[PDB]
Amino acid sequence: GIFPVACSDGYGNMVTTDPKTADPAYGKVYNPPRTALPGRFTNYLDVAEACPTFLMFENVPYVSTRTDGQRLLAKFDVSLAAKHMSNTYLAGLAQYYTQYTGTINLHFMFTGPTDAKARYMVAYVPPGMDAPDNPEEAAHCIHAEWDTGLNSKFTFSIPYISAADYTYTASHEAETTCVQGWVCVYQITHGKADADALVVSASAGKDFELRLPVDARQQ
Amino acid sequence: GIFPVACSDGYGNMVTTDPKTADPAYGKVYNPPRTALPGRFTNYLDVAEACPTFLMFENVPYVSTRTDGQRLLAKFDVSLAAKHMSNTYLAGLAQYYTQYTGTINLHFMFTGPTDAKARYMVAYVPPGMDAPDNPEEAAHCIHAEWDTGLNSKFTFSIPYISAADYTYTASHEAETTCVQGWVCVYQITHGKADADALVVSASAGKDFELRLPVDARQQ
Amino acid sequence: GIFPVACSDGYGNMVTTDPKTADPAYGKVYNPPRTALPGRFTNYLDVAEACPTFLMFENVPYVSTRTDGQRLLAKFDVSLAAKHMSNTYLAGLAQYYTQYTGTINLHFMFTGPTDAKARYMVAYVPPGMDAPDNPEEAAHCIHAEWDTGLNSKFTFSIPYISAADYTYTASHEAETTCVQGWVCVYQITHGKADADALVVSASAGKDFELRLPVDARQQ
Amino acid sequence: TTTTGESADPVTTTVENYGGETQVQRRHHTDVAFVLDRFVKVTVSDNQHTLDVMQAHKDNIVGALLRAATYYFSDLEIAVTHTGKLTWVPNGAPVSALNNTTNPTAYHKGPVTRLALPYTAPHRVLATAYTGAHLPTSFNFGAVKAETITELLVRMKRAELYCPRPILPIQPTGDRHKQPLVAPAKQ
Amino acid sequence: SGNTGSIINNYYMQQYQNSMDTQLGNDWFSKLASSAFSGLFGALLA
Amino acid sequence: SGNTGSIINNYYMQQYQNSMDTQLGNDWFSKLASSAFSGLFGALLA
Amino acid sequence: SGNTGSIINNYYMQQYQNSMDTQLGNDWFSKLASSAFSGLFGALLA
Amino acid sequence: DKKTEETTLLEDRILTTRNGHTTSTTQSSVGVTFGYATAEDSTSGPNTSALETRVHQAERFFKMALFDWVPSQNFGHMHKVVLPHEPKGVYGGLVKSYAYMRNGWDVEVTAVGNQFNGGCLLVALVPEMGDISDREKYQLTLYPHQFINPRTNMTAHITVPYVGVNRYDQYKQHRPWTLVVMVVAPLTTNTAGAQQIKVYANIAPTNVHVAGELPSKE
């Protein structure tokens, strides 16, 4: 006799994503040597941590000092869908996973002249209230103030503080408010700093994670 | 050559209940940590032993002292189908197994006032006769008498005494009498105890077992 | 790649008698304990050796002393088909196997009164001649004579003496004479023994074997 | 065995009290992980359907028993009788994804197509109830879409249950609920 | 045991393939067949 | 674990067959059922 | 390596299943990501 | 619990509970029922990027009334409420200043009548309670519960852990705990019972943790 087998129904269907490997046919082929080719990357999120890309505020990456005093320079949604991200590598990447968790880094590089000085504040407004339009109200959230000097750049981490352990990259229609709060960045004062640009970029944080790959897009 | 196999006929058919596992497709997924979530249960019958639910006597869980003297407070069928069970967890559970064996526990909590005293009797009438309507006739079966005092509750086990080792949870049309006898609970006397409630519940016994899962119900 | 298999043609067909076992579906079931149930039997032929059943001679199990002297009390075919077997367990059993080999035991229990004495002879007439109708001619075959006394019963073995090692339980149409000879039982004499019954039964012998199960019958 | 009833502390007497002798049990069958580990039909209405275990019939063994707990966790196995390509998408995916084939899409091989899918919600556990009724968007195992979805079944693997909820039978008309049980042909 | 002749063991656990028996506490006709007298009971000559 | 009875291990890695749980830091009713009082509370005669 | 999860090895030799690489003579962004400054650069109070 | 002297005609089984600077003595305890566990899961999850903190001040007693139990209301009459409900004081303040938070409950329900009343209440706490049917009031004992029965006790005490599909919640739109009280035996009054019984609750939010400080105008 030969070995009796049961060909189970509902098993064997093709599947665009199965973890097997097709049989081969053309063998004994030897690839040209590619030892030490520059710039290899192993996991996207590495480049995402290493290279911060720019945020957008109506066609521009920077924010402009309207005038001296307590002005709210910017305020936005904490979603990878956010309009301000859009041109951002992080968002372009996140668009292929349903969920995420993690810290996001904001970078503020002051571009002004040597005689231009300013002081800023950035805060993370968790949901539950409405994003305050002035520092003194925002002074109660996790925030950080800082002035200009020799060091052009200032980095700041946006904390993952949510009910669930993961959250969606995607944005639901039913959501009016950004499920994860906002981050508003103010100016406290300045002098001779009007007109001057404070270009901002964002990179992935250390514990930032992307999970559950999905292909929702046109074709 | 390759390995010769015999694909046996009558093997492989789907089957809603087979002990195999389908192939997978979406892998490398990590669940949020659920360490030490309160109230986990592992086997239904544990909760069934731990939490006794109430019996029913026309919309109510208790039994009421009609008047002083030898009154038969309640009497019923020993089946998980019994009208008195019905609202009972034990019955709601048993409804998914054909057979069972085991001890069932009855609990009698006297709710009366401090000046209300009574004495009761409970017996298990095995089939073969007709359930006696008065203690002296019932005094010959496995019974237990008891009075009221500091201790509100009294528990009592209903013995599995049948011809077969297992019995049906279900009740056949052809059965006129409850295949497993009845349990009648009397009152022996009382004083100032009229009107007062003796609420009863039932829990699964230690050696109580449910076997042979079945899905008979609407959809 | 995956493991390349050759699904051989002519293999896998159902088969009412194959030595495999179907896949299961309802598991984790525990049988009630059946330890030490009386009267278990493991192989039919054991009961067949242990319990001899009766032969038949026109509606009766016994043979009757016609009258004193050299009378031939009975004579019959050595086949499990034989009319005299018919009501016999051995035959009822043999009916499901094509072949057999072995010794068959004949038992003669004298039922007469204390004042009734007789002497009998039994022989096995192998085929090749015609069954003799009187002892002196039969005295030349394997035979055994014996009288009545305290011991009611007398057992005697019918030897398997055939050309082939096995023989058919079944009887072919083309066979005029019983392929395996006959056994004739006489009476040598008696006194006051007329009318009296000599009931006979048959059991399987020690080396008696049944082989090649077959299902030929109505449905 | 008298107890202070008000306590709420469990009490379990035994036949030993009057002279009996409590025996052994094998409650394998009443084991959570086990009972729920079987297929259950779920009423599909379109040719696309979000996977949700609450959709099993509330009186069906699995659904009745699942609802006998308030919080639960489990992986899924599904059996779909469909036509054309069957595509699955993970919890929280834009619905528009169902049309894309680079997502776990299984070609046809009738009758049914069977798959094993990972718990894919973003909560530590899911719920049967909820008071904050109508259950939240996120309480799903993703969604499926195929040109044609004739039938759909699901199986819960690795089931964990927390906090028991009630589970009722039928309210009998008379003294007990009599009915026709599987019996041999009369003859 | 019965009409079964696969040399390799079942792919499925025996807990699923069969019903498990329980005990509480070799048989009969077998024993009885053997206890059968086979001698002579008499006194043999020659 | 559940209604599963193959004696041979899955052909696929467990990392693909299932979701992997993470930990951060035997259960309840089970414990509670056992802590049940089963004595008498009184004083027994005979 | 990639989306592959069979526990048993390929039935076919790796010389046929894949192309064999040759060498002549762990990488970059990976290294670069790690070399990231994460301190403060200032002088901390409180 | 237990008391001394000897035996007597009055009550014993004394027990004092204390949360923060608030106590609650009871010469008629019947013990305290414990939730679904003895200790809550890890209070510092990833979902809080460990910016969470705990406030000892919140963990104190606060009173809130329930209803009046009268002979009229019979079996199944039930009074439910979701905790926190309107929260005042320190505890309340937390809800207005933190986006997410979590805590369990120390509940002490007290139906003070008098030992000559008959009748009996069932008090329980339920996770995600969403309207029970009439039938399933019979299986209410599956929840952390405790009976009040005049012949025996005056107070019922149940302690319970925080639960939920989320390590932390937004009480402002999901609370898991619902404290219910139901009549199982209608109130008896007899010759010298109390006409009617006022039912109150003494509660304490246990192990309160909060995360995500919100902005503020006042």
**How is D17-35 classified by DSSP, letter by letter?**
GGT-------TTTTBHHHH
Q: Which of B167, B171, B180 is nearest to B212 (CA)?
A: B167
> CA–CA separation, D183 vs G1, rounded Å?
58
Minimum CA–CA partner of A104 in chain H: H49
G22 inside 8 A of chain C by CB: no
Q: Which of C5, C24, C26 sits opposite B2 (nearest CB)?
A: C5
> CA–CA separation, H183 vs H195, rounded Å?
16
A166 inside 8 A of chain B by CB: yes
> CA–CA separation, C44 vs C97, rounded Å?
13
CB within 8 Å: C8 and A2: yes
Q: What is the 3-state secondary structure (H, E, C) of chain C?
A: CCCCEEECCCCCCCCCCCCCCCCCCCCCCEECCCCCCCCCCCCHHHHHHHCCEECCCCCCCCCECCCCCCCEEEEEECCCCCCCCCCCHHHHHHCCEEEEECCEEEEEEECCCCCCEEEEEEEEECCCCCCCCCHHHHCCCEEEEEECCCCCCCEEEECCCCCCCCEECCCCCCCCCCCCCEEEEEEEEEECCCCCEEEEEEEECCCCEEEEECCCCCC
**Dihedral, CA of residue A8, residue A13, residue A17 and residue A22, to nearest 10:** 90
B37 inside 8 A of chain A by CB: no
> CA–CA separation, F36 vs F33, rounded Å?
6
A215 inside 8 A of chain B by CB: no
D10 inside 8 A of chain H by CB: no
Q: How far is CA F1 from CA B14, B81, B93, D6, in A?
A: 21, 31, 21, 38
- Residue F46, classed as helix, strand or coil, is coil
Instruction: Calculate the CA F30 to chain-centre distance.
Output: 7
Q: How many CB pairs under 8 A join C and D?
A: 5
F33 inside 8 A of chain B by CB: yes
The two structure tokens encoding residue D110: 């009738």
Beta bridge partners of residue A158, listed in sequence order: A104
**CA torsion through residues D86, D89, D90, D92, sign:** negative
- 8 A C-beta contact, residue A106 and residue A203: no
- 8 A C-beta contact, residue A212 and residue B31: no
Consecutive H or E run containing D134: none
> CA–CA separation, A111 vs A191, rounded Å?
14
CB within 8 Å: C13 and B9: yes
Q: How far is CA A96 from CA A17, A218, C103, D131, in A?
A: 15, 13, 85, 33
> CA–CA separation, A103 vs A142, rounded Å?
14
Q: Which of A9, A170, A172 sits opposite D111 (nearest CB)?
A: A9
Which residues in chain D are contacts of C30 at CB distance < 8 A? Answer: 26, 28
Which residues in chain A are contacts of D106 at CB distance < 8 A? Answer: 13-16
Q: Which of D142, D98, D150, D136 is nearest to D116 (CA)?
A: D142
CB within 8 Å: D2 and F41: yes
Q: Where are the domains of chain F?
A: 1-46
A23 inside 8 A of chain C by CB: yes
The two structure tokens encoding residue D68: 């006998």
Q: Tell me what percent of chain H is helix, strand and coil, each rounded to the nearest 5.
A: 10, 40, 50
H-G interface (Cβ pairs under 8 Å ≥ 3): no
Which residues in chain B are contacts of H116 at CB distance < 8 A? Answer: 113-115
Helices (H), D17-153: 32-35, 61-66
The two structure tokens encoding residue F8: 């041979």
Q: Which of H36, H143, H167 sits opposite D124 (nearest CB)?
A: H167
Helices (H), D24-94: 32-35, 61-66
Q: Which of B180, B185, B62 is nearest to B133 (CA)?
A: B185
Task: Go through chain E and list every residue after which a break occurs, taking a C to next N gap over 2.5 angstroms, comma-separated.
Answer: 25
| Angle ∠(H68,H69,H74) on CA atoms, nearest 5 | 140
Q: Which of H66, H185, H71 is nearest to H121 (CA)?
A: H185
**Dihedral, CA of residue B170, residue B171, residue B173 and residue B174, to nearest 10:** 120
Which residues in chain B are contacts of H190 at CB distance < 8 A? Answer: 113, 115-116, 192
- 8 A C-beta contact, residue H29 and residue H154: no
Which residues in chain F are contacts of B47 at CB distance < 8 A? Answer: 29, 33
Q: Which of G3, G4, G19 sits opposite A29 (nearest CB)?
A: G19
> CA–CA separation, A111 vs H75, rounded Å?
76
> CA–CA separation, A154 vs A122, rounded Å?
11
Minimum CA–CA partner of F24 in chain H: H42
Looking at the domain that runs over E1-46, which CATH code has it been given? 4.10.90.10
- 8 A C-beta contact, residue C89 and residue C107: no
Residue span of the structural domain in which A37 resides: 1-219
Rg of chain B over Cα atoms, rounded to whole angstroms, equals 24
Neighbours, chain G (3 or more CB pairs < 8 A): A, B, C, F
| Number of structural domains chain B divides into | 1
Q: How many CB pairs under 8 A join E and F?
A: 13
Which residues in chain A are contacts of C1 at CB distance < 8 A? Answer: 21-24
> CA–CA separation, A180 vs A79, rounded Å?
7
> CA–CA separation, B163 vs B135, rounded Å?
26
Q: How far is CA D101 from CA A217, D118, F41, in A?
A: 11, 19, 69
Which residues in chain B are contacts of F36 at CB distance < 8 A? Answer: 49-50
CB within 8 Å: A14 and D103: no
Q: Which of C57, C111, C130 is nearest to C88 (CA)?
A: C57
B47 inside 8 A of chain H by CB: yes
G2 inside 8 A of chain B by CB: no
CB within 8 Å: H45 and F24: yes
- 8 A C-beta contact, residue C77 and residue C178: yes
Instruction: Please state how this structure was obtained.
Output: X-ray
Rg of chain F over Cα atoms, rounded to whole angstroms, equals 22
> CA–CA separation, D1 vs F39, rounded Å?
7
Do β-strands B30-31 and F20-21 pair in parallel, antiparallel, or remain unpaired? parallel
CB within 8 Å: F28 and H37: yes
Backbone phi and psi for residue D95, each to the nearest 5 degrees, phi listed first:
-55, -35
Q: H165, H166, H170: which to substitute to probe chain D, counting the most D Cβ within 10 Å? A: H165
CATH at residue A153: 2.60.120.20
- Assign residue A171 a region (left: φ > 0; alpha: ψ between -120 and 50; beta: otherwise): beta
The two structure tokens encoding residue A55: 């945020």
- Assign residue B10 a region (left: φ > 0; alpha: ψ between -120 and 50; beta: otherwise): left
Q: What is the DSSP string of G2-42?
A: -S--BSSPPSS-HHHHSPEE------THHHHHHT---S-SS
The alpha carbon of residue F26 is apart from the nearest alpha carbon of chain D, in Å, by 12
Q: Give the number of other CB atoms < 10 A from CB of residue B130.
A: 10
Q: Which CATH number fits domain H1-218: 3.30.1330.180, 2.60.40.1120, 3.90.550.10, 2.60.120.20?
A: 2.60.120.20
Consecutive H or E run containing H197: strand H197-213
The owner of tokens 């997502």 is D103
> CA–CA separation, C103 vs C124, rounded Å?
12
A positions 157-216 inside 8 Å of D (CB): 164-168, 170, 172, 174, 212, 214-216
Minimum CA–CA partner of D91 in chain A: A98
For residues C31-56, b (16+ Cβ closer than 10 Å) or e, as one string? eeeeeeeeeebeeebbbbbbebbbbb
> CA–CA separation, D166 vs D70, rounded Å?
10
Backbone phi and psi for residue H91, each to the nearest 5 degrees, phi listed first:
-55, -50
Q: What is the DSSP string of B17-76?
A: T-S----B-S---EEPP-TT-TTEESBHHHHHHHSPEEP-SSS-SS-B--SSSS-EEEEE
The alpha carbon of residue A25 is apart from the nearest alpha carbon of chain G, in Å, by 7
Backbone phi and psi for residue A197, each to the nearest 5 degrees, phi listed first:
-90, 135
Q: Which of C200, C215, C214, C209 is nearest to C85 (CA)?
A: C200
CB within 8 Å: C30 and B211: yes
Q: Which of C189, C121, C106, C116 is nearest to C153 (CA)?
A: C106
H128 inside 8 A of chain B by CB: no
